[PDB]
PDB file of C-alpha atoms in Angstrom:
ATOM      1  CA  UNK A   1      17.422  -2.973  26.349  1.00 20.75           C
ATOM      2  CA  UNK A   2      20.773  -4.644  26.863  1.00 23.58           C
ATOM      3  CA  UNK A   3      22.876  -4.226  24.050  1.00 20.47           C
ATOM      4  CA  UNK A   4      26.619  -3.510  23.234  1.00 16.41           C
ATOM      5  CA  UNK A   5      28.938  -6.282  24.055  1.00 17.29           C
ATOM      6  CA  UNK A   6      32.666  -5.044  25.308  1.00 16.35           C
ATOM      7  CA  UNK A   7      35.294  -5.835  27.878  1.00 14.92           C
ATOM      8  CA  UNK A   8      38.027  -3.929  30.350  1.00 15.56           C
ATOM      9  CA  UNK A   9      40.818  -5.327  32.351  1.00 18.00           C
ATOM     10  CA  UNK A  10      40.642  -6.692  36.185  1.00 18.95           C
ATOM     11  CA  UNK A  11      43.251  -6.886  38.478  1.00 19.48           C
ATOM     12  CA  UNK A  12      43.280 -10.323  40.290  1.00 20.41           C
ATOM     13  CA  UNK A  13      46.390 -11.316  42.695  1.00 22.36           C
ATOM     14  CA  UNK A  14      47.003 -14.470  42.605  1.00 22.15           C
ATOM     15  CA  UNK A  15      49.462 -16.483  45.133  1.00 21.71           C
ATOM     16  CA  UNK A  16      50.224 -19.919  46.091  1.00 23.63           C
ATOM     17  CA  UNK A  17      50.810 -21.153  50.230  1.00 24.48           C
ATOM     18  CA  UNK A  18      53.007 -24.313  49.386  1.00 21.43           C
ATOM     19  CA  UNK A  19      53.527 -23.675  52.851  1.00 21.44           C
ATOM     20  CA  UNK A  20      49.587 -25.475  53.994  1.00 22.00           C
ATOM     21  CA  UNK A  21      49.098 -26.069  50.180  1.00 19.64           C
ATOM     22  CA  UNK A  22      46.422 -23.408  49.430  1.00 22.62           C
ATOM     23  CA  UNK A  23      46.161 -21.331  46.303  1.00 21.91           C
ATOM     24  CA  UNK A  24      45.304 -18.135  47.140  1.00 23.45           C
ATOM     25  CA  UNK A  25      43.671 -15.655  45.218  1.00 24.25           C
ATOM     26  CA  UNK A  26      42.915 -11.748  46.109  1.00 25.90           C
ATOM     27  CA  UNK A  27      39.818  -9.714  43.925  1.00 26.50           C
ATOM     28  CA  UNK A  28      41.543  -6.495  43.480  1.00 27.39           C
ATOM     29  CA  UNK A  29      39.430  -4.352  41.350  1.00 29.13           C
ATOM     30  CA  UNK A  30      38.195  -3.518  37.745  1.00 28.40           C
ATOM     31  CA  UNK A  31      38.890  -0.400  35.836  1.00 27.63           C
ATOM     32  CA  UNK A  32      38.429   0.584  32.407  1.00 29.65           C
ATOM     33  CA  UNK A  33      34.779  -0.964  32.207  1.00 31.54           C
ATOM     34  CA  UNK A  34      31.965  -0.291  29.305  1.00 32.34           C
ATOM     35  CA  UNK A  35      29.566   2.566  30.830  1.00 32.14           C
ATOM     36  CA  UNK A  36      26.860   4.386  29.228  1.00 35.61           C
ATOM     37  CA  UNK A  37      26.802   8.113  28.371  1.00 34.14           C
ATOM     38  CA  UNK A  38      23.768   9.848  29.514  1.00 32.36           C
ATOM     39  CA  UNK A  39      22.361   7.165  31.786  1.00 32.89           C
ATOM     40  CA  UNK A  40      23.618   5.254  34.704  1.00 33.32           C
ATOM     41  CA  UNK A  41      26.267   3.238  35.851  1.00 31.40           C
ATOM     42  CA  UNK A  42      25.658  -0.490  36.626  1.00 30.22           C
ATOM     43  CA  UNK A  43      26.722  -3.105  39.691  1.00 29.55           C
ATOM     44  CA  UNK A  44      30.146  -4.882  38.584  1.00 28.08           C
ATOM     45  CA  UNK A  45      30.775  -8.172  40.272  1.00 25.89           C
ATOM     46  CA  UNK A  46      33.402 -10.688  39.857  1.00 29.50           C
ATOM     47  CA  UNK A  47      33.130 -14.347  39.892  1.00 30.74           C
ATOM     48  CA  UNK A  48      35.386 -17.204  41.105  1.00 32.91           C
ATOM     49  CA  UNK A  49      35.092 -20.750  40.217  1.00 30.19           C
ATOM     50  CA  UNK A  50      38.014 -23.290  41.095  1.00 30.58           C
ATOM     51  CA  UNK A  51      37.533 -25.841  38.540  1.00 32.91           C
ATOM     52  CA  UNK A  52      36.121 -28.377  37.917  1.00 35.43           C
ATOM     53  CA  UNK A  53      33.184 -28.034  39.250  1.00 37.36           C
ATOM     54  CA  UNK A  54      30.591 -25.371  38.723  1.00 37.99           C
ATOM     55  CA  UNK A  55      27.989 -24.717  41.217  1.00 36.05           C
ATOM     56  CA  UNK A  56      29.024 -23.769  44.480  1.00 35.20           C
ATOM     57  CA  UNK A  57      31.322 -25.578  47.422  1.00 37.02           C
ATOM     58  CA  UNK A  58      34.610 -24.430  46.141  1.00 37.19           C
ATOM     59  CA  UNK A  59      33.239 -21.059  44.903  1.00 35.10           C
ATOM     60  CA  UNK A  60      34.072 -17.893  45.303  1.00 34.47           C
ATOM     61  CA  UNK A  61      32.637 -14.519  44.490  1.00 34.74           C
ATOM     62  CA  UNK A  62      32.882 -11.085  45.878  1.00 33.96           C
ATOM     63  CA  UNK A  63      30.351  -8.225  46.947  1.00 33.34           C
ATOM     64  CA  UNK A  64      27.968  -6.611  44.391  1.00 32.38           C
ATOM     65  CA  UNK A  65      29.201  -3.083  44.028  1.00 29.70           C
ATOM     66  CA  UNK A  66      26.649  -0.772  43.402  1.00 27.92           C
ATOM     67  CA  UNK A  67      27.272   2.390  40.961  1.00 23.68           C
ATOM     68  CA  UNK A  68      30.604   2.001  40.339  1.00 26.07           C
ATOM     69  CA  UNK A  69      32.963   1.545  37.310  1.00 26.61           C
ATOM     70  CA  UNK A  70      35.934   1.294  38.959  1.00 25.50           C
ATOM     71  CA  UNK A  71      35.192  -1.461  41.588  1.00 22.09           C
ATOM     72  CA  UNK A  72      37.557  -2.646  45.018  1.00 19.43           C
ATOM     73  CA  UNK A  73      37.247  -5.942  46.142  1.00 19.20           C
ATOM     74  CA  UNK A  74      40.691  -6.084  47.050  1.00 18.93           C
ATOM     75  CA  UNK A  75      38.680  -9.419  49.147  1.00 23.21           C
ATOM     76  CA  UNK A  76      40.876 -12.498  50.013  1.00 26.20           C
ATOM     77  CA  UNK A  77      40.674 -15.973  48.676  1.00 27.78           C
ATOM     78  CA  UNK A  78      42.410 -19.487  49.594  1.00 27.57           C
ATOM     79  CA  UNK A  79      41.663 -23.107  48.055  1.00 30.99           C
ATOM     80  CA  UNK A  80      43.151 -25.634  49.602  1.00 33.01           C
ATOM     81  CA  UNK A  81      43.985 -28.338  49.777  1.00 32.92           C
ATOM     82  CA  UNK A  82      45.783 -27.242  46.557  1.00 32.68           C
ATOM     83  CA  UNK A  83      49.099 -28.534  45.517  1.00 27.79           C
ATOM     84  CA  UNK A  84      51.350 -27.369  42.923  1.00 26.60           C
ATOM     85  CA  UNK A  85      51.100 -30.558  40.836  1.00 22.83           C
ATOM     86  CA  UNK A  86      47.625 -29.931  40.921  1.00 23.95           C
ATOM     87  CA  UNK A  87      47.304 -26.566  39.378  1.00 23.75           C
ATOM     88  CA  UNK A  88      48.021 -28.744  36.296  1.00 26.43           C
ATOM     89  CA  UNK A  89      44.480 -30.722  36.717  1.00 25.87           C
ATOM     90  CA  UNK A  90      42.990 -27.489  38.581  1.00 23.96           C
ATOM     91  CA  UNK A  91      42.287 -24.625  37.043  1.00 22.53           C
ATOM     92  CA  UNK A  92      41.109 -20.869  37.644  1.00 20.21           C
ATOM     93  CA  UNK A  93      38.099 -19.365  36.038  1.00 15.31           C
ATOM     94  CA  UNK A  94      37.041 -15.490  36.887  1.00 20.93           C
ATOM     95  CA  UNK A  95      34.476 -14.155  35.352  1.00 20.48           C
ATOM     96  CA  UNK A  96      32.951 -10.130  35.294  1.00 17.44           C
ATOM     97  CA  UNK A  97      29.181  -9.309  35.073  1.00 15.99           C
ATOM     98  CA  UNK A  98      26.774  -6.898  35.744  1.00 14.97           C
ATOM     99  CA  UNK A  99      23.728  -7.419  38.108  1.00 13.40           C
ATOM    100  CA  UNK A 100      21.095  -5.785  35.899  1.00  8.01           C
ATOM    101  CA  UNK A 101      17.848  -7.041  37.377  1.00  9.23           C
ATOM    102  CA  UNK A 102      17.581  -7.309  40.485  1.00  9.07           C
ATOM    103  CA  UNK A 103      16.704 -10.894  42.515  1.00  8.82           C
ATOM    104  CA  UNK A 104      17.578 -12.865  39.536  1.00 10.84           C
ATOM    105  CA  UNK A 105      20.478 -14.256  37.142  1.00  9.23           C
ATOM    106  CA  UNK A 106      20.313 -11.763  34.286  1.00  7.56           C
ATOM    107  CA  UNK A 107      23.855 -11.303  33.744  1.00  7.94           C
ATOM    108  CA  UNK A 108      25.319  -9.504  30.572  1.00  6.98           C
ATOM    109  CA  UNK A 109      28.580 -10.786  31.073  1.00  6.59           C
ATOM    110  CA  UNK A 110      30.940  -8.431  31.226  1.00  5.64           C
ATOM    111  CA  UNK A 111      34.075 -10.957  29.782  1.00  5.48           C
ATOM    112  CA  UNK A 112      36.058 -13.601  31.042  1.00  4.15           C
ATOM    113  CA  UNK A 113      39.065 -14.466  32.432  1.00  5.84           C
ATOM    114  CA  UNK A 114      40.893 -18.122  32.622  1.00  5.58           C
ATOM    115  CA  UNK A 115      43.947 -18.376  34.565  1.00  4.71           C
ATOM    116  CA  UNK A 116      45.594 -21.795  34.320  1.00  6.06           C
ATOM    117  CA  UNK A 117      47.296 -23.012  38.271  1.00 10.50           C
ATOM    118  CA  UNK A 118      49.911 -24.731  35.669  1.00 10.47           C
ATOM    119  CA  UNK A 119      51.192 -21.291  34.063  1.00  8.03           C
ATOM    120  CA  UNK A 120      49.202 -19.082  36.553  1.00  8.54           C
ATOM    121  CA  UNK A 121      51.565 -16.107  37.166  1.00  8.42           C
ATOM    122  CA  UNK A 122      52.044 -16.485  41.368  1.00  6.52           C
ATOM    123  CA  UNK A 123      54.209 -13.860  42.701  1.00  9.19           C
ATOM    124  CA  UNK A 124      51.776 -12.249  45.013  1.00 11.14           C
ATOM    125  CA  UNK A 125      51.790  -9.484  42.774  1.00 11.10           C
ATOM    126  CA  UNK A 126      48.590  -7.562  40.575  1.00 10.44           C
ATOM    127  CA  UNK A 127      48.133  -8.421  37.761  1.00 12.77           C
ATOM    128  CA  UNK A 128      45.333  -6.828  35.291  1.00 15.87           C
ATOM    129  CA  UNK A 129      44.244  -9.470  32.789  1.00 15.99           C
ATOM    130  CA  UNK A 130      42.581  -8.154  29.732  1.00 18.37           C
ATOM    131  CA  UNK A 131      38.363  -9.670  29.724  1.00 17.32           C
ATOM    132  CA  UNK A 132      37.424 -11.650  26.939  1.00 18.66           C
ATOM    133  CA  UNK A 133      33.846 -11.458  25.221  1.00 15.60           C
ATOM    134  CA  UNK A 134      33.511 -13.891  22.940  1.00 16.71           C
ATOM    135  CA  UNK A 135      31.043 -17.361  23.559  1.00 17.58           C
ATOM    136  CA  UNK A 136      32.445 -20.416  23.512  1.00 17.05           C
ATOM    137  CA  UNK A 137      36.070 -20.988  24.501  1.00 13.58           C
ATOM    138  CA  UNK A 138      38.700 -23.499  23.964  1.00 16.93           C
ATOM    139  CA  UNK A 139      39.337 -26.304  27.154  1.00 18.01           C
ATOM    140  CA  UNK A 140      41.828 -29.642  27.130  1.00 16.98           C
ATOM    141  CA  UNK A 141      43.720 -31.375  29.853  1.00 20.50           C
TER     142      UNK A 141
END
C-alpha cells in the first residue's frame, strides 16, 4: 500500500527565555490531517530537530499517538543555551509522520515544517503552520 501524498496544518508554540537564553518550543497538536475513508486511522507524530545537526542530542520529538487525527502534544520544549543572535545560525525544523509499521523507520511523511529562530514568530502564542509535501527544499545561511 502507501499511497496518496497530502498535508494539514500543526500548531507549534514557539517562545524564546532571553531570560537563561533558551528557545523554547511547545508541540500543540495537528488537525486537519489526510485519513482514509473506510479503513483506519494512523499514529501521527511530530518531530523536532534544532539544527544543525541531525541525529539525536539536541532532539526533540513527542509521543506516538495512536488512532488519532487530531493529535495533543501540547508537550514542552527548551534549547538552550540559545541566544537571539543565534537563531540567525540556528534554525528550527518540525517535521509530521505517520508510524505505519511498527518497530521500524517506515515513515510516509506527513509534510514539513521549517521555522527560521531569525524570523521565527516568538510571542508565546499558537501558531498553525501549513505542512509542506514536496522533496527537496531550499537551505542558505
Amino acid at each position: 500500500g502507501s499511497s496518496g501524498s497530502s498535508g494539514g496544518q500543526l500548531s507549534i508554540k514557539l517562545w524564546f527565555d532571553k531570560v537563561g537564553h533558551q528557545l523554547i518550543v511547545t508541540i500543540l497538536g495537528a488537525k486537519d490531517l489526510p485519513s482514509r475513508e473506510d479503513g483506519r486511522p494512523r499514529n501521527p507524530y511530530v518531530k523536532i530537530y534544532f539544527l544543525p545537526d541531525r541525529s539525536d542530542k539536541n532532539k526533540r520529538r513527542t509521543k506516538t499517538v495512536k488512532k488519532t487525527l487530531e493529535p495533543k502534544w501540547n508537550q514542552t520544549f527548551i534549547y538552550s543555551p540559545v541566544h537571539r543572535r543565534e537563531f540567525r545560525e540556528r534554525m528550527l525544523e518540525i517535521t509530521l509522520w505517520d508510524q505505519a509499521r511498527v518497530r521500524e523507520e517506515e515513515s510516509e511523511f506527513l509534510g514539513e515544517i521549517l521555522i527560521e529562530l531569525e524570523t521565527a514568530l516568538l510571542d508565546d502564542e499558537p501558531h498553525w503552520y501549513k505542512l509542506q509535501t514536496h522533496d527537496s527544499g531550499p537551505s542558505s545561511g
